[PDB]
Amino acid sequence: EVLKPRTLADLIRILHQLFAGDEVNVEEVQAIMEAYESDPTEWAMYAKFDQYRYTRNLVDQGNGKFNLMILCWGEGHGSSIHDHTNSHCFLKMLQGNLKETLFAWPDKKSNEMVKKSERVLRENQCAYINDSVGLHRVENISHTEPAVSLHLYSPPFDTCHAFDQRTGHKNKVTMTFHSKFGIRTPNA
Ligand SMILES: [Fe+2]
């Protein structure tokens, strides 16, 4: 019953329809993204890794409605604890596996941060998060294999906050692209 995109190209086309409006059905988007069968032949042009940290690779600008990007996690690479600047955020596995740890939001008080949930995203699985759901950290589970994920943010955003697990203090972080449309960006 779920519309199954047969290619990354089909999926992008479907996403343009699902975000053409002002409403967006989260479970519907989640199911269609999950239904797409990851095919490395179709997204290898975006799979540009860096030795020391993960990379963000823009695939499609979604007519200003959303950003679609591919994130490449080297061996052992992970993110900090961050928020998502009041946007919808979908992340689907394209290769390997990521461990998502959901964190609760900190008070004004300084305290160790509390884990709310911990899981591994399976092959082709699509997960969903926004700021009302919680904060999270994402990491490659493997020290011998990469992980690759497909992320969709609506509306688009280029700033977020990173959180110190020990205190809950946060810092604003401007997010950058490693590449856009298969083309490396100036200055990593
Ligand atoms: Fe995230």
Swiss-Prot record:
Q: What organism is this sequence from?
A: Homo sapiens (Human)
Swiss-Prot/TrEMBL cofactor(s): Fe(2+); Ni(2+); Zn(2+)
What does the UniProt entry list as the effect of changing residue 160 to S?
A: Reduces enzyme activity by 20%. Little effect on iron incorporation. No effect on zinc incorporation
Residues that bind Fe cation? 82, 84, 136
Q: In which tissues is it expressed?
A: Highly expressed in liver and placenta. Low expression in heart, brain and pancreas. Also detected in hepatoblastoma Hep-G2 cells.
One annotated GO biological process: cysteine metabolic process
PTM statement from Swiss-Prot or TrEMBL: The thioether cross-link between Cys-89 and Tyr-153 plays a structural role through stabilizing the Fe(2+) ion, and prevents the production of highly damaging free hydroxyl radicals by holding the oxygen radical via hydroxyl hydrogen.
Q: Name one GO cellular component term.
A: cytosol
Q: What is this protein called?
A: Cysteine dioxygenase type 1
